[model samples]
Target: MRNQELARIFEEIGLMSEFLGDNPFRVRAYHQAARTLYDLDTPIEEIAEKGKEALMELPGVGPDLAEKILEFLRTGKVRKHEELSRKVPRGVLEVMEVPGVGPKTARLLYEGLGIDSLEKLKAALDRGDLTRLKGFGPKRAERIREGLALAQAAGKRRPLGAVLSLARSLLEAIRALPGVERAELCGSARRYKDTVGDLDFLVASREGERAVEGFVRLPQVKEVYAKGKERATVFLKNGLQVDLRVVPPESYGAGLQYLTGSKAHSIRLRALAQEKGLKLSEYGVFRGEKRIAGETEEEVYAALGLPWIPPPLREDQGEVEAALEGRLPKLLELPQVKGDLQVHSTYSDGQNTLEELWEAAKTMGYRYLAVTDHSPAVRVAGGPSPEEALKRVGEIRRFNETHGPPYLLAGAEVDIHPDGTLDYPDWVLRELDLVLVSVHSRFNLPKADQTKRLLKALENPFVHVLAHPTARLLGRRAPIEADWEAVFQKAKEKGVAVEIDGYYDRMDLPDDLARMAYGMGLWISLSTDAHQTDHLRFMELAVGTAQRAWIGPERVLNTLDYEDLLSWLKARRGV
Candidate 1:
């Protein structure tokens, strides 16, 4: 969809508008439009087809923004975007994107230090010249270097949620190719990794050459890297790469086994085949010149004396062994998540009202949604005061009385201060159904200090879950260092569930950390950290991350039905 592309352009326009010191309101307008477009369920092109009147009906899409959308659709370019693109060095945008680098910092680096790009910034830091700049001490310089490295690394992978819709559309188009028999997405995407490197698709067809030709001609193709009778690779307009491979119908399963691989998982399967005195290849499994299994994945696995495994569990992280031992976990399914723990509403940073959030939640089959708005300390989100919070509780109770079963539980994402104090006092905290505490500042604290801070916060009886424990924003910031074993141990003792925040950018308590928490017998809290209604869909991502961590339904707080959830919360609070 052009939604992502247009949203990105508008977002860039907003940034450039800020860098240019343009009208503050217009800058916000651009950003709001960008976000609305990005989250929009219907395709932007479809709205464009219906004309600008339909586009204007969208939130934040005023006449000016609507016209710009039309401009991009008609000519594949925006005039205002091109105008701003000239005023801002693209490198300045990159420099400003690092976690700690603001526009002022980027401008100072550009003018004072001649640092326009990440490479230039890195070179300056390596040469000990970056520290010479005003306000940039040796410690600050080191942090920038670390941030730059993080930005570079994060640049390589796109969030699976962000790219999924696009991939499915492409898959459907490819499947419609005249001679194709079947097709499936196969890769880290297929495995549902939170972040995907690129997309891989396997197609089975009689005429491989025709399939490759059709694939290269996809409407979204920006460039064709390679094309052959059996394979083709192309880049999309958004710079995502997709690989397509075609094989004869009989060998489709074998080709899929080879391509849908986690390197380690495939290696184990190959060795298993070898140990059985059989050979495996993209063509088929061979037993002394006799083809045993190739037409289906179940057939290949059965021939090797193993049961079929789900794609998400093919990560080779003990999953191979689990499968071999016939002990693979029954991973958490999307349908099992009964409620969302961290959703915001118009009372805070969220775009939707409480009623809208509820309607959307109910549409998703949720029995409950905790209205966890930011507390007083998160000023950027218009955090509510203690009095406002109490008022919200009254509102929720009234809404639930009329709304019936799908309940709204008033909650706050109370901040944990640097010195280990919570944003709200216990009296205020005790009034809420779900009290979530998170670290909002002092991210650079020393490991001992940070751990001490987290440990102290978890001791609060009202604090149910520690949201985004590491405070990492994927691609922008790295997780703060902490003695996790001790942290998880404390969480287990305190009954403070660690969060698997599935906000695409901050999939914090990342899979590895989530795994560690699960191993420590700690409960997990899943949330989308959604600011808008469309974001609730990210629960799939949260469940996917939980699966990666090898969690079962029993250990997740949201798996409990509403009444049981209330009991657990009360029990944890020692009431």
Candidate 2:
């Protein structure tokens, strides 16, 4: 939407303004304007149609910002944005995009070391030159280096959460094509990988050429790279590559299995077929050139004397063996997630108020929702003091008393200070229904210190879930270094659940880590870390991540019904 486009532009303007040492208030205004646009439900274009007065009515939108919005709507470009772009070095913007390196850090690097590009920054980091600058210690330099790696990785792969909806819509369009019988999205996306290189689609149709033709003409297609009778490859308008293959209906299952594969897993299966004196291919499983089975995935697997494996576990991570042993996990499903654990509300930075969130949660059929607003220390999120937190708790309790099922749990995403103490005192924490602790800063601490910090935070009797334990912003900040085994072991002992934050950008405790935690017998908490109602959809991403980790409903706290969940929370605090 144009709202998103303008929001991004405004965000960049804010960062560029900050980089150029503009007035602090003006820079903050730009950022706040950006947020207003981002959270705006109505189209910015529709609002602009109501004239500049309506635009100015938006929160944080002053006359100057309102004028800029008009300029963008009329001319398709903001003059102020172009002016700032010309003044700032492009490389400075790229540097600022890295997590932990804000505009101030970018300007400092440019002025202190003439480090304009990522290349120069990397060279300086390698030589320990950044350590020469004030406040740039070994830890800070190391953290930046890690962030740089994440930035580079981001260039090569897109987060699944970012592209999932687009992929599903495209798949739906393909499925409705005249000649198409069935269609499925394959590859890492189907496997629910946090990041994917591209989309792979397999379609079953008798009219291969017609299906292929229809695919390349799809509205989402930007450029056709190749088109054949049975296959076509194109780049979507969003710059994600998609490969489509049309196969006969008989071969649909075989093609699905072959295309929805990790190369390692496919290779292992092929070897197994050879041992059984059979041959397997995308076309079918054959015995001496005669097809034995291929119509369905179950039959294909049955022919190989194995059970069908779930896509998420087809990563060749002992899944093949597990299937053969008849020990495949009944993976967690989206329906099993009863509620979101780390939701935000207007009390902090969330767009929806408690009542608004309740309505949305009720529609989703959730038995409970956590209104975990930011505690003091997250100033940018409107951090509430301990006294204010207790006041909020009272409001939440009152809301629960009035609004019935899909109950709201008064909670706080309390910050764990560098010294391992919580932002809220115990007295305030005692009044809350649930408590989620997280690290908001000091991400560059040494491994031992980070581990110790987490361990100590869990020692608080009130602490229940450790939200986004790694604190890694996917493709932005690398996870902080820590002795995770020790941390998970301690969490298990304390009955503290670790969160799988599914906020698209912050898929912290990513699959591998979540898998590690699950294997350690630590309870899992899945949350969208949502800031708005639309964000509640990310619960799907959370469930996908949990399934990828071989997690089941029994291991997740959100699966508990309202009364049971309440009992668990109260049991933890002995309330």
Candidate 3:
């Protein structure tokens, strides 16, 4: 089982335990272990093969959780989780997911109205049943009614980051099948969109029927929604939908062109084809019924009198116009990145130590890395005091002396106080090699106030970048409203690079905002904002977002080599 699958079981077990009024500590253990597994980049199967000692090495994986992990790997099920499932109706868990509904409220609704599903919840609300309950009023019922729609929307979509592992595995499985020559992930996932509704695969094969057959029998498939000679759709056990389309090797390019699309982009392409006196479809591009081009994506675009647009730029957001005008940029790629500017370490709530972080960065071939732990204001995150911050810098220098080149910079993700002052003094910040100023509180502040707060931080000579600028967590929190153009303008004036944080939940300075910053000629920095060594892989996500934002290496700060980056920072510091 994948880490997410195992993590989900433990998380659900915690919820079920909580609803059942089980011991709070037991519930906490499950929840904590679930988080550890979810963040774990290592395959659980490998840990299982290595034995219990390997699994126990993970944070929060104690004797109980380790046994559960082994049990899950051995039998594909955790006995405790199965027992909890028997006690808690599955729909009740979904109910708990709905906003404004807690364990007590969910239990009451389940016991009183037998409201187990969204259907039942809506029916009760329609009948005004919730107002009769002790804590629920008509107002609460209305909030829940709104929440149900949100919950339903949330359920129908999955973050692209969450489904990446499964999507890649399915692609590989199809590629290894007999008669299949090629298989590639297409659609939103290929474009690296923030969220994807489903996974789409385009396959090239001589035997379409065999390819379809092999796909339908994949072990991950839970239910086959449709099956045919050249097409099939299946839902995984976790409810993620997978779609496969098979085409002749000759039309592979055309098939990919059709499947890997934003619906709007495809419509625009067909319209463009019509204007050119040509026809375009999944089979081939035609001029007067003569196949002109379809052998490759480059050929398809060339036939349409345009260059091959990068997948990340395939969204119909002025990219088509840019390509027509020969204004499309050479988008940023993963290899150009030589450093990770925002990384956490043992000084904060991060799982790894400074030495471990350094080793991981070296393993990934980074030329430089900044270790930015939290300031004293973020107490829950184990933020350090000013004295400790200076000491941390000393430690970083010592490490660099011992292991030079692939340099490590001591940094602080300093807090931007509500009043537009920094948590640390200028003296302390100047002592560090880099500073990333951010907002960690008052998410609900007025837009003007938030903008002012950030602008003040940007004006600080010590600040190099802004971390997760909007402070938005996808699904859980909306982006803080601000006059971003003004903010970006000020950031540009101050020579502060805005970060594109690719920390799974926080892909802040979202594509649209990042694009705006690029348009303003502002520098962009990409970081995993990783709390653990395994999270370093998120650089792919960061690079993907930068590509979507139309950023090039020249516009990205980390694309510079270690010496060049240091030279730029020193120039900015006026030292």
Candidate 4:
């Protein structure tokens, strides 16, 4: 058997090298082995334990490279990576974040101008340093510089995970304004994209400018770019840019009708507008002398003789036909959300205390909240002893009795062990009001073992739902390896739900996964997994993701009011 260790490292180096435009043949081998890891039915570590020679059985790996991989696995560093690190500033990888700049451009920029970072690259462009480099002309430099500026400018898209929360918060804040009637969030967040470029907000208000003043002042806002009569551009502290436009109170429905668009669907709407000699704008549709009436988004549809359109189906996916036929799915809205079940506090890795989390949940207008701290499996034994768990429960009991503001549910985010069992006792499980089991470690496990562990956890009567099941963080690490189809099947069979964690970084069980879960008749739980009070708003992202998956109140667990959620949990628990 060949050493899979060195082979894996070379494989990583080779892939990065390929992405870097390194030698093709040399890069090919690593990529092929990387692909082989996907194919290897056994865990890569399993083969590692058998020693380097075992990997020779892998299709592309040969004896020498396998030995190298073994040498790498034993040591913390790979020889190839060491060499590459020395040659490459490592900033090239970071610079590649600018869309159009590929390996060649990256290398050229580095060698010609020594621009190692985006900041430096921007500086270089500002100084016209790029135009002076070899093979660079006014036009190419202009394109690169222009493209980089556009990227840097508009590129600050909130991870698709964040757009929903911000959009929702803005929608609510604006809705709270005196002139506002109804508000909606649109854009990629509505599509449940793995990530989002920016946020688009549509509102119906008597006064557009008045509705926006407070939103612009939101703590999340870093700066307000343009605030005018009917529109405003608020740039968030997180680099996400938001464009908020308000429609006249009566045009609320129509503006929403026009603004809530998928490219193709909106194109069709525009095409329809052209046929009728009408122009559809944010204000309302106009047809020469005729101010085609649109009081609500539905009115716009009524004007067109179509029914109200729901968001999920609006992706040009025959949504037009559905609307014309009055068959749009009743998608869930924030109002339908009654409780937030996944929350945390300082007891675990969370930033607030349980009392603070509960209070914040109440202020956000939720009827109930769950304080689900991390279980023992995680590095945090927040309750260093089971006594501590009871102690915390005592505090929760006292708060519920004293305030009775909103039902404060108590639970834990129990870690799914390597064996797929939760890290809590039967009695411990019995005492909790909610339980979200998840895999916090062992991402290296192979497909079968990983699946088995998860499935086993689902069988635990105390495991109410799976939290961030796939453990993928958007634009960061990829999803853990697993057969999602199989896992969803198990969830359906066991009546276990999966979480669409709205953390901006982790939109796990992404759009496709959410859609599949919905199709299988399995409910999805949307949660912010909130640590701070601010994160309570992540539910908006969860809603956006659900909309993308075409899931609504009927298909989502969190959308259910506190009563329904409580009833469901009780039934599942045989209480």
* lDDT score of residue 546 within candidate 4: 77
Error of model 3, residue 364, in angstroms? 1.6
* Model 1: per-residue Cα lDDT over 1-575, one tens digit each: 67869988998898788777889999999989877876564579988889888989898998999999988988999999999888789788988766567666777778788888888978877988866667878667655776676557543887788888789888898998989998999988877787888699999999988888988987887656446557776777555678888888998898888778887788888889999999777667889889898988888877777888777778777877877888888888888999999999888888988789889988989999998989878764545778888888889889999887679988999999988989988988899999999988888999999999999998888888999999888778889888899888988998889999888888888888998999888989999999998888888888888888888897899999999999888883321
Question: What value does the lDDT take at residue 304 in candidate 2?
Answer: 85
Candidate lDDT values, in order: 0.84, 0.87, 0.84, 0.71
Better of 1 and 4 by TM-score: 1
Worst 10 residues of 4 by lDDT: 1-10
Report the error of model 2 at residue 434, Å.
1.1
TM-score of each: 0.72, 0.73, 0.74, 0.62
RMSD, one per candidate, in order: 18.5, 20.0, 17.9, 18.7
The alpha-carbon lDDT assigned to residue 139 of candidate 2 equals: 71
* Residues 73-98 of candidate 2: C-alpha lDDT, one tens digit per residue: 99999988999999888888989876
373-401: candidate 4 lDDT, tens digit per residue: 88766755445355666677777888789
Error of 4 at 21 (Å): 33
Off by over 4 Å in 3: 1-118, 121-155, 381-383, 573-575
Total clashing pairs for each candidate: 0, 0, 0, 18
Better of 2 and 3 by lDDT: 2
Clashing pairs in 3: none
Task: Give one digit per residue, the lDDT tens place, for model 3 in 368-432.
Answer: 98899889886544448789899989999999999886799888899999888999999898888
